[PDB]
Symmetry: C5
Subunit: 272 residues, 5 copies
């Protein structure tokens, strides 16, 4: 079923904000790509995978937000007798372009925190494999459930509201498992981290947890607020969540990765 | 409410100038991106964050101006019985694509001046955090106010002119606070700068202040001149302001960052 | 004859999944391009051709999936009285954009496995030449056969179902020959590989074989399931197959190439 | 007023040549960007600014020609009952997209010749500032004058032919001043150039002068030849002029910059 | 006159093959650009110009094939009552987008063979200048002649078939001269090449000659086969010719350039 966005009309500002947010995020991510590409070398090689992952996540995110921007532009047009942007006939907006890209982002983001905790080899591979499984299942179960949002919002003639709940609850179980895997890594860092590194890893985990927590809220929004102001708020919190979870987290984790690099005597890391 | 631009028609030249300006700026910024990417290494590592920020700002700005270019092309079409470019039916131009990207640019630009003053660590982080707060509030308050510009221009049937003023005045308070934070950094540079560096930092601040000051003028233009010639002038001063605030400032600040690099004996900085 | 996709209508979700998959894959490949570009140097020079090939394959794949994404968007439009995406009049979707790009990917992927087995010079060239011949013939014979899929699916008025079979069976003969060439290389690796390298090469071959095997299934799908749910499943298995055969295989083969690099004392490979 | 191009119809070949020229130039400049990016390091650091400028100019030029290509495609369509490309209703072509980008190119091109003459510091800055002033005024005065070209061509109902002349003549005064600034730099090179360097700098100046001289001709063309064959010739000479002034000049000036690099003992410059 | 392509209709497969070929070639060239950019450094500096030229040619070729792809998509649309792709009203396809880009490719390709033969300085410059003159004249004379192809094919109402012949024959004279210049360079290589290098240079020349020879055939095709199957064959042989002449030749010439690099003791060339 089409997203709740398609069943509304928009004031100039409601539509215009959302197109600005989609455009802002594409730029943040492309700018982040340039920054992570330009600064990766400064990390020691045994942490440089984390640096590289951040560039990969930026590409993924930039295309995710760019496609949403395009589809948002395509899917509505102004009507001057209504003074509203209104759905165009041949096109329907999907908030689910974003889910599929999360299949890249989510396991990568969790993986780079584990890389900086200092896991290597089989132990990195094992943790990567659990997080990827846990991640893909969270995301796929959520993607199914968001196909039922016109139903949960009570748009006449759409049925299957229960499906929204079931798929969300299953999804959230997979979320908890990922948080348990990562909580176990940051509590058990490898390579004799300092107590400062020890602390910065814990902060990275709670930052991860706080920012990832917004996404389940944005999921449930059609239930609370299925209106054009709700759509505006939902796209605002997705934007806060994307920039934090991906770019701000990447900069924070880069700072820990540099401290570890320098503590093990990487000279590029020390000169800065 | 749609921007004042949408309530006018344009002579060939009025429209054509504006599309040229949008296109010119996109090119300046992409060219600036190449230049900052090609010259960053020449800066010492303890100032290279400034170099990197300039590349980030260039990406941000290039996409900001590119989207405006696209929307400007989309939003109007020629009419030969009027010999004017006139608003197309399904699309409305927004001068507010630019505001959202300022959320990247403004705190970054101020941050790179602080990096070159020589702040590091917690002291950099603290200043970055104040400038980001001050910056986002200036920009968000201004963004609200520019949604009221058809009202302030007296386009029949648009109300809320007072909202233009209130949101502008609040915005300007946040501007003053940012200028106070930066004034305190350039007056208190770190790392035993030379008296030449000391002077060049002060010039960077006043350049920043002069160029940033144009933006509040472009804001108030619908009040002074809500006409197609006014729209032309407004887009000319935004263009002067963007190129100065972002690219020319970046080159100037790079020159200070190099002088500091060389004074601390960075050899790449000395060989040039 | 146009692909079976053109003879169906789609529910919102059927269409929307497929456009998400095409978009997801383009992003995976562009992100993979960044990753392979950023990590190639870490491989020793005598294996760096493999690293370079992975970047080449990523470009090829990203454009292949991007074209499909574009054509998928162009080829159908929503109809609200049918609540379906339906074929647009002037455009027809082709699943065969993907075949032509395989002419790059398939011989390159097989070549980089041979490079890492340690063949060099004439022996690399000979094997490259056999695999390229075998590969192009497999792909060209398959491309002919997929022009007959409306016929094999029993779309009224389309004839030549037998042509689907003949061209598929011929294609599969060329597949077997490529698998025989590669099986001979991984069983006869060069340069005194360790027993761990020896094992990792064999795993690379079976991974290659498993993932390449999905493609002949996706070929035969119009025969089993010529429905919109079948089209959905087919595009899901192509997506699993593309990401595995190209990106995941590239990361796995990079790990072997690094182990070999380090065993021969490449210092960048050892520091990580 | 719209450019003279808009008042004509085109044979297949007239239109097709022009779209080919616009496309050819975009490619030359993008290819030039790759070349200047790949070869900049070979120059000594004290001349590397020249190398960098060439990359900047290439980006600028590629976007200038790309936008003209796009607008040329947008602005006309084929009509089979006339067998002509003819102006589309909603769009008008502007030859003035190119002027605005010259604001980047012209002062940069002149600046890089001064860099290679060996000016540095204040003396470079002073000369850059004079050339930028002289350049912007030449270009802005010319841009005004080209808004009067339908008038000078005698398209019925367009007045202000005199404005074409006045703005052209003013523009040309600013041209002469730039040529005087540059003539003074190449006659007074810095850093004890060889007599070969001394000669190569003079050739660079006369090459600059010859190629820049074509642009004032292309300006005056509506006066001589306001026909579709004239439009073809004008776009041919702009293309010769762009490739020469920007790319060929950049390669020539790079050869001088390398000779100077090698004479001062830059080893990368000597090994090649 | 419009190309012969415009006077035909296409079966699904005829059209679909051609759009696949245009798309395949764009990808090969972009992938080739990445490969040549990633491997240039491995060549010794005195041969690195050849490496750089290959990247330049790849950019040129990628845009040439991309524009043809776009125009091919734009110029025809499906008609279900004819089951054919048929010319759209407002657009006409030109096979001559490709000619203009040859102005870059042809003299560059010939130049890089001369660079690897070991010519330098004035002797390189002289040969570059002859090949560029010879090349531009071959290409411009051919470009004129291909404007007469509807005439030579006997499309009713198109006259000037003789012009096809005259311009082709003139063009071919310029071809012979280029082949004579290059034949003289590969027979007289510089820098005491080995007998293996001596042989590999001769093979490069005959490869060049064979692949360049296809282009005059594709020219003459409207004479032999002015049908949709002919158009298919012509675009197949252009595709074989482009990939061979540009990418495969570049890889072959890179192998010679590396052998020469290593023989003169370039260590990066020896380690691989
Ligand atoms: C559209 C993007 C535009 C970017 C173009 C920037 C180049 C413009 C330069 C104008 C000349 C101003 O004056 C001159 O500026 C350059 C560049 O900062 C300075 O150049 C300095 O940095 C460059 C680049 O890191 C070094 O190669 C150079 O050796 C060094 O001196 C000169 O010391 C200064 O005297
Ligand atoms: C949108 C793209 C992202 C832009 C990134 C902007 C980063 C700057 C904002 C944060 C500033 C406050 O926090 C500051 O962050 C920078 C960058 O992480 C840190 O900087 C650290 O990494 C950079 C980059 O590898 C080094 O050049 C620097 O010497 C080092 O200290 C500072 O030690 C920290 O105090
Ligand atoms: C579409 C993009 C082009 C992709 C290019 C892929 C080509 C490789 C497959 C062909 C293999 C044929 O034979 C092989 O070619 C490669 C590439 O020139 C050569 O490779 C040579 O250059 C590469 C790159 O500079 C070096 O890392 C390598 O060590 C060196 O030997 C081999 O010595 C040769 O035996
Ligand atoms: C779409 C982008 C695809 C790339 C994304 C990243 C993929 C990696 C995910 C981690 C997989 C777990 O397995 C892990 O893989 C990485 C990358 O191959 C390996 O990493 C190895 O190569 C990288 C890059 O050359 C080195 O910085 C690292 O030190 C080295 O060990 C680990 O040794 C392995 O245990
Ligand atoms: C399409 C955009 C890009 C086109 C660039 C192609 C350049 C082609 C050059 C044609 C040959 C002319 O003559 C030749 O030029 C090249 C390039 O400047 C010079 O080459 C010089 O610079 C290059 C690149 O920095 C060095 O690798 C080379 O060793 C050095 O000699 C030759 O010394 C000169 O004799
Ligand atoms: C049409 C103009 C094209 C300009 C593209 C500019 C891209 C700049 C990218 C460079 C920044 C990243 C470099 C990473 C360093 C390793
Ligand atoms: C898609 C899900 C990916 C699962 C990854 C499983 C890895 C198994 C061990 C390595
Ligand atoms: C027309 C009413 C149908 C509502 C059901 C939609 C079901 C959504 C299923 C999505 C599955 C996608 C899985 C990813 C591959
Ligand atoms: C204990 C550590 C707490 C860290 C919480 C950070 C939350 C950041 C929110 C960003 C939107
Ligand atoms: C130290 C912690 C820093 C937290 C920074 C959070 C930044 C939030 C980004 C929101 C961007 C969206 C704006 C609409
Ligand atoms: C058709 C594709 C052409 C792509 C051109 C991309 C731009 C290349 C310039 C890259 C600049 C690199 C700067 C970083 C150097 C360190
Ligand atoms: C990032 C979120 C910013 C939201 C801005 C809200 C703008 C409000 C403008 C309301 C004007 C309404 C006028 C009547 C219609
Ligand atoms: C003393 C400081 C003087 C700085 C003035 C800079 C003005 C720049 C204007 C650009 C528009
Ligand atoms: C101290 C040097 C000051 C340089 C200021 C340059 C101002 C550039 C303005 C941008 C050009 C816009 C043209 C319309
Ligand atoms: C508006 C465009 C700005 C962003 C361009 C994309 C930049 C990509 C940078 C990736 C560089 C890869 C690093 C290669 C290392 C050798
Ligand atoms: C060394 C012989 C090369 C054989 C031809 C390679 C395959 C070409 C297929 C097209
Ligand atoms: C690269 C050449 C590919 C040629 C493919 C030919 C496909 C033939 C299909 C024709 C059958 C349809 C009959 C109508
Ligand atoms: C879709 C990915 C499937 C990978 C298959 C695993 C490879 C087989 C490993 C066993 C070889 C012994
Ligand atoms: C031991 C091998 C471990 C790697 C296999 C895991 C990756 C295979 C699956 C990747 C394809 C995912 C595509 C998602 C589509 C929904
Ligand atoms: C599908 C998109 C693929 C993008 C390919 C872009 C390739 C850019 C090549 C950059 C080469 C120049 C960098 C040289 C700097 C040293
Ligand atoms: C001394 C510096 C003076 C700079 C003048 C720059 C003029 C820019 C014109 C726009
Ligand atoms: C940047 C400044 C550009 C100013 C250009 C002004 C051109 C004026 C042309 C007017 C011609 C007559 C118009 C009749 C509608
Ligand atoms: C004495 C110097 C003579 C140089 C002339 C160069 C002319 C270049 C023409 C390009 C068009
Ligand atoms: C004296 C140095 C060599 C001069 C070369 C001049 C090259 C002119 C470039 C013209 C390209 C445009 C072709 C259009 C047809
Ligand atoms: C010198 C080595 C050259 C390496 C070229 C790397 C090219 C990478 C280009 C990637 C572009 C990604 C853009 C992301 C779009 C969202
Ligand atoms: C770069 C300049 C190329 C000029 C090409 C001229 C082509 C002439 C073809 C005209 C013949 C057809 C006449 C039909 C009316
Ligand atoms: C002895 C020289 C033989 C070279 C022949 C090369 C033919 C290549 C064909 C590519 C198509
Ligand atoms: C000596 C090696 C010869 C290799 C020739 C390769 C020919 C490739 C061109 C064809 C590309 C596919 C077209 C279908």
């Amino acid at each position: 079923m089409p997203s709740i966005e398609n069943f509304l009309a928009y004031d100039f500002w409601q539509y215009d904000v959302i197109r600005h947010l989609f455009a802002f995020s594409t730029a943040v991510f492309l700018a982040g790509l340039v920054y992570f590409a330009m600064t990766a070398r400064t990390t020691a090689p045994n942490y440089r995978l984390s640096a590289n992952i951040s560039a990969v996540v930026m590409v993924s995110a930039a295309l995710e937000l760019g496609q949403l921007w395009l589809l948002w532009n395509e899917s509505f047009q102004w009507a001057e007798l209504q003074g509203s942007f209104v759905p165009v006939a041949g096109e329907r907006f999907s908030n689910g372009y974003r889910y599929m890209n999360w299949l890249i982002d989510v396991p990568m983001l969790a993986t780079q925190l584990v890389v900086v905790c200092g896991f290597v080899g089989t132990e990195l591979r094992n943790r990567w494999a659990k997080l990827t499984i846990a991640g893909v299942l969270m995301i796929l179960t959520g993607y199914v459930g968001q196909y039922f949002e016109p139903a949960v919002a009570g748009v006449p003639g759409y049925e299957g509201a229960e499906q929204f709940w079931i798929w969300g609850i299953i999804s959230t179980a997979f979320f908890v498992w990922m948080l348990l895997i990562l909580a176990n890594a940051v509590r058990n860092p490898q390579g004799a981290p300092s107590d400062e590194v020890r602390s910065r890893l814990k902060f990275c985990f709670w930052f991860l947890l706080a920012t990832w927590s917004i996404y389940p809220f944005a999921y449930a929004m059609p239930l609370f607020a299925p209106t054009a102001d709700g759509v505006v708020v939902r796209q605002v919190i997705y934007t806060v969540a994307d920039v934090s979870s991906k770019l701000v987290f990447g900069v924070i984790l880069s700072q820990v990765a540099l401290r570890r690099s320098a503590e093990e005597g990487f000279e590029p890391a020390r000169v800065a």
